[PDB]
Amino acid sequence: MDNPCLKGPPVPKNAAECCVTPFLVEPSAFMTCHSKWIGQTKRQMAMEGIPRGCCVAECVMNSTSLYSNGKIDREALTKLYLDSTKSMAPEWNKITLDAIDGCFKMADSIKDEIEAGAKLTPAFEGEQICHPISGTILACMGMTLFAECPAKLFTVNDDCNKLKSYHSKCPFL
């Protein structure tokens, strides 16, 4: 099938306007990584075969010293997400801990595909190969946190319904 994520979000509305979610990196550090790697990330969405590792995510993980030779430091990642939740609604503690558990469980279930993705060779000019672990975790975290948002903390409007639909399958890039 055609990659649904090639369409981009259906509305340019900032997701924070739908729900304020926990984070692992400050927006400024995320934007630096996004600007550097979005170009090739979009190209990789239009390539068949084994999913190609997302460099935007590896950049984010490197900015927080969480990534090392195909592994993510779960202890340090949990500490960072929990830090962001300290002044948030109390519902976020459990939602965050459950989201981390589910994302690491999912990553383990696709270990072989992730490992094969790490071994891919550049398929176009200047493509940088990144290990898929960072994107596997980060994509899952963002989508799960947004979907678990309590209705009392979620903006119930048409544009946020569109973002809920889009982001149930497509990660925050």
Domain of 4: which CATH number? 1.10.238.270
d(CA 5, CA 66): 26
CB 99 within 8 A of CB 73: no
One-letter amino acid identity for 81? Y
Residue 103, domain extent: 1-173
Instruction: Tell me how far apart the terminal alpha carbons of the chain are, to the nearest angstrom.
Output: 21
Q: Which residue's structure tokens are 């729900």?
A: 19
The count of domains in the chain is: 1
Q: Which residues contact 152 (CB under 8 A, 6 or more apart)?
A: none
Cβ neighbours of residue 61 under 8 Å, at least 6 residues apart? 67, 72, 134, 137, 138
Contact criterion met (CB below 8 Å) for 139 and 54? yes
| Structure obtained using | X-ray
Closest CA to 96 of 153, 165, 144, 152: 144
Distance, CA of 157 to CA of 18 (rounded, Å): 9
SS (H, E, C) the chain: CCCHHHHCCCCCCCHHHCCCCCCCCCHHHHHHHHHHHHHHHHHHCCCCCCCCCCHHHHHHHHHCCCEECCEECHHHHHHHHHHHHCCCCCCHHHHHHHHHHHHHHHHHHCHHHHHHHHCCCCCCCCCCCCCCHHHHHHHHHHHHHHHCCCHHHCCCCHHHHHHHHHHCCCCCC
57 and 25 in contact (C-beta within 8 Å)? no
What is the torsion angle, in degrees rounded to the nearest 10, for the CA atoms of residue 35, residue 135, residue 166 and residue 168?
A: -150
